[PDB]
Amino acid sequence: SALTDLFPLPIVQAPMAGGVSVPQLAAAVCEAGGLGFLAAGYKTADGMYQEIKRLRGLTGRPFGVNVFMPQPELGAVEVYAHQLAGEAAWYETELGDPDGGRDDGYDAKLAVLLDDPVPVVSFHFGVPDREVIARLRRAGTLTLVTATTPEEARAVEAAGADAVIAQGVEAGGHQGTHRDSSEDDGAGIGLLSLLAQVREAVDIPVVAAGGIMRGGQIAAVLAAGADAAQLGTAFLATDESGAPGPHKRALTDPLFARTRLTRAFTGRPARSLVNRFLREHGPYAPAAYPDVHHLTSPLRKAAAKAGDAQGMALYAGQGHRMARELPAGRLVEVLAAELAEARTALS
Amino acid sequence: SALTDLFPLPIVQAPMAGGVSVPQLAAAVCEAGGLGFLAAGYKTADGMYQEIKRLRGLTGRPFGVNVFMPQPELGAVEVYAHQLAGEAAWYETELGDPDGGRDDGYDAKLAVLLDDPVPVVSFHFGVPDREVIARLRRAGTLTLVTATTPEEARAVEAAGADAVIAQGVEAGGHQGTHRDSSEDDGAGIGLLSLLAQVREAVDIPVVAAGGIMRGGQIAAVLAAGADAAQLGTAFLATDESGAPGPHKRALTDPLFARTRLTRAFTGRPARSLVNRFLREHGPYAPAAYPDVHHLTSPLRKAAAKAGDAQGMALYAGQGHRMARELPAGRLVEVLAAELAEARTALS
Numbered sequence: 001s002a003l004t005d006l007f008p009l010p011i012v013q014a015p016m017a018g019g020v021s022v023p024q025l026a027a028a029v030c031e032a033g034g035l036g037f038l039a040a041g042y043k044t045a046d047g048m049y050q051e052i053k054r055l056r057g058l059t060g061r062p063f064g065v066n067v068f069m070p071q072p073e074l075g076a077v078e079v080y081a082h083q084l085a086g087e088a089a090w091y092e093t094e095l096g097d098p099d100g101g102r103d104d105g106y107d108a109k110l111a112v113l114l115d116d117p118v119p120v121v122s123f124h125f126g127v128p129d130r131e132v133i134a135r136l137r138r139a140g141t142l143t144l145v146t147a148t149t150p151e152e153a154r155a156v157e158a159a160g161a162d163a164v165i166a167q168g169v170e171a172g173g174h175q176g177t178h179r180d181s182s183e184d185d186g187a188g189i190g191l192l193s194l195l196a197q198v199r200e201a202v203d204i205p206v207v208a209a210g211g212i213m214r215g216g217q218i219a220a221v222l223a224a225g226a227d228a229a230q231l232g233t234a235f236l237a238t239d240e241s242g243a244p245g246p247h248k249r250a251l252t253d254p255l256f257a258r259t260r261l262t263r264a265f266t267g268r269p270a271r272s273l274v275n276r277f278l279r280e281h282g283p284y285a286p287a288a289y290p291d292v293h294h295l296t297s298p299l300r301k302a303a304a305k306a307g308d309a310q311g312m313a314l315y316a317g318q319g320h321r322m323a324r325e326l327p328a329g330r331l332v333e334v335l336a337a338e339l340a341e342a343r344t345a346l347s
Numbered sequence: 348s349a350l351t352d353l354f355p356l357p358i359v360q361a362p363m364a365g366g367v368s369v370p371q372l373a374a375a376v377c378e379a380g381g382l383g384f385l386a387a388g389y390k391t392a393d394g395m396y397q398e399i400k401r402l403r404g405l406t407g408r409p410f411g412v413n414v415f416m417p418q419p420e421l422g423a424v425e426v427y428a429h430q431l432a433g434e435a436a437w438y439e440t441e442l443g444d445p446d447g448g449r450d451d452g453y454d455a456k457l458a459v460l461l462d463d464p465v466p467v468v469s470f471h472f473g474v475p476d477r478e479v480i481a482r483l484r485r486a487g488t489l490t491l492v493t494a495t496t497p498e499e500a501r502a503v504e505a506a507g508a509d510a511v512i513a514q515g516v517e518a519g520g521h522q523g524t525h526r527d528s529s530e531d532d533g534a535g536i537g538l539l540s541l542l543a544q545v546r547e548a549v550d551i552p553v554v555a556a557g558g559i560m561r562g563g564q565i566a567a568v569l570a571a572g573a574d575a576a577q578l579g580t581a582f583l584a585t586d587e588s589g590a591p592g593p594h595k596r597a598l599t600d601p602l603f604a605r606t607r608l609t610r611a612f613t614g615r616p617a618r619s620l621v622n623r624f625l626r627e628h629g630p631y632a633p634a635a636y637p638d639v640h641h642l643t644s645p646l647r648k649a650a651a652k653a654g655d656a657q658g659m660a661l662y663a664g665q666g667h668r669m670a671r672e673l674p675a676g677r678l679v680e681v682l683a684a685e686l687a688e689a690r691t692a693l694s
């Protein structure tokens with residue numbers, strides 16, 4: 001409730017890196033009664049700060065900022081790089097440096113978030129030290145962390161976080177596993193099942209994420225114990241979304257009818273529409289994040305520049321085909337109406 | 348509604364072959380207001396008939412009977428059989444004949460179901476010819492068919508079935524795919540997402556299946572458009588369930604903390620608790636059903652006889668750890684109370 005008391009509708013716009021969730025998206029969601037989110041992933045502490053300032057100028061409503069947890073360091077990357085030689089030659093460029101930073105400006109970003117507190121902060125790819133959570137709490141910032149299993153959820157709670165984001169296997173983008181291993185492959189838990197398990201494993205509020213595209217699904221997760229629903233793909237296709245045109249188009253394109261979890265683009269499991277890049281490199285992508293992400297960055301930028309969807313990281317949840325293209329503000333009101341209608345029906 | 352009008356509670360006990368859903372289980376579910384189910388899979392038309400008679404003597408309430416669709420015929424089986432040589436030697440037996448029937452007494456079973464109509468009949472592993480559905484309808488029998496994608500659901504509707512069972516990836520036992528192929532691997536759709544897609548693809552009632560263990564999850568699927576919820580694993584652990592003791596125990600045993608889809612036991616994707624047999628033969632199991640099932644039958648019977656869970660097909664959904672051991676009748680009333688409580692909360 002401490003979370004749901006911040007905004008009127010149980011709808012959260014998921015932070016989406018790669019220039020997807022720009023300030024204008026968050027603002028439209030915020031102004032419509034939902035919780036807009038900025039994505040600090042892959043940006044510099046300064047870049048993130050500029051968006052925060054920008055957004056404050058667009059809305060006075062509560063919003064969130066998401067940060068990536070630093071990843072532990074460490075021949076597999078060399079082999080994969082070799083297999084990408086053809087991609088480099090084709091897009092006429094060179095692979096990025098796989099040994100770049102792995103902290104993603106964590107320290108600097110926390111410094112910014114503590115020096116000028118924002119309403120909400122979420123973390124992905126792990127759990128912050130409980131000291132980070134305590135300091136943010138004292139600053140008046142609510143904290144959220146993603147969990148993909150009841151065990152990870154317990155870790156989130158034990159750290160003192162205000163709420164846990166239960167991200168099911170249907171979710172688009174990166175799976176928020178706290179540690180990536182070949183064992184996670186084929187072990188993903190369906191949201192409806194994960195939510196029930198998490199709801200019984202912890203006592204803190206739960207935000208449900210994964211495949212939510214309609215108001216009735218929001219009603220569904222609330223009925224199963226969630227305090228709110230977090231939607232990424234549904235907002236990815238809205239007008240304020242900064243996602244590339246080829247990306248927004250792929251979502252409802254019959255030729256991109258299926259999605260699959262893959263490490264091809266970044267070295268960590270992420271759900272993307274199946275395309276050429278995924279089919280050819282998916283089976284061989286090693287578990288090396290963010291090493292692989294650095295490596296393929298030039299390839300993806302080149303592909304995007306050319307408008308070639310077959311070479312881009314088309315992150316999307318299993319509900320992508322139900323995506324709707326319209327202002328984010330209108331999407332929220334539509335979702336709200338569907339929610340109301342579903343509530344009424346269930347009574 | 349034609350379906351939900353047959354019984355008071357939106358709860359369906361999934362048919363479970365292998366001696367799991369015996370007449371006493373179905374009866375307890377029926378008498379508690381739900382829809383009990385008998386499983387005709389792997390049985391003879393006569394065997395199925397005896398259970399039908401038995402059940403009628405235990406309850407006058409509506410119940411269902413499930414039948415397997417005949418599978419198309421067709422060196423991979425020879426290789427797998429070779430890899431099982433050690434299992435045969437250990438359990439001191441011989442592998443079964445992989446070239447046994449593939450129809451599973453379909454014709455004879457339909458003859459029985461048409462000569463002495465039952466309230467409900469469901470089909471698994473495909474869609475019956477529309478003539479079979481029409482004749483059963485004329486006999487006064489409602490028909491259900493499982494679908495794992497919006498496309499399969501459309502096929503179910505086009506065939507004239509009364510309702511489609513949307514079985515999500517979390518479901519225990521066999522995935523009801525109409526055709527099995529290596530491509531289905533890693534393509535499973537989370538129930539919450541599948542349900543929304545199916546609800547919008549067809550106009551007939553939808554029965555949601557997969558990972559449902561609590562009343563709140565039943566409320567969740569109803570809110571998302573389902574007319575009822577079908578539960579297998581939840582009833583697998585009840586006292587009336589005929590599942591082996593080692594099987595019921597594994598469900599909540601920490602040593603069997605995870606489930607995975609595998610072809611190891613039958614040649615078709617089925618979700619089972621991870622065990623020795625699965626770890627060793629899963630990666631090599633070919634797509635050959637029911638050939639592989641015939642082949643491993645002696646191995647599984649021997650394992651069950653010895654009470655060795657590591658060599659049994661421990662079918663179970665991702666919610667297995669939430670299984671409760673008590674009379675099926677009491678489980679239904681508990682689920683009903685949880686459902687009511689969830690409805691109230693959502694209002």
Ligand SMILES: Cc1cc2nc3c(=O)[nH]c(=O)nc-3n(C[C@H](O)[C@H](O)[C@H](O)COP(=O)(O)O)c2cc1C
Nearest residue numbers: 014016017124171172173210211231232233315317
């Ligand atoms: C475009 C793409 C980018 C994403 N980027 C982030 C991110 O930067 N940080 C994060 O915590 N989650 C990210 N997510 C995951 C979302 O938080 C959420 O779990 C997911 O979008 C839920 O599924 P649908 O996408 O709602 O099915 C991303 C998802 C997609 C769709």
Ligand SMILES: Cc1cc2nc3c(=O)[nH]c(=O)nc-3n(C[C@H](O)[C@H](O)[C@H](O)COP(=O)(O)O)c2cc1C
Nearest residue numbers: 361363364471518519520557558578579580662664
């Ligand atoms: C013990 C085991 C045996 C099953 N046998 C059958 C069967 O014979 N016919 C059928 O249509 N479905 C069968 N199912 C699948 C169920 O119809 C249902 O989809 C599944 O149980 C739903 O998941 P939970 O098991 O509810 O998570 C079986 C499932 C399990 C648990």
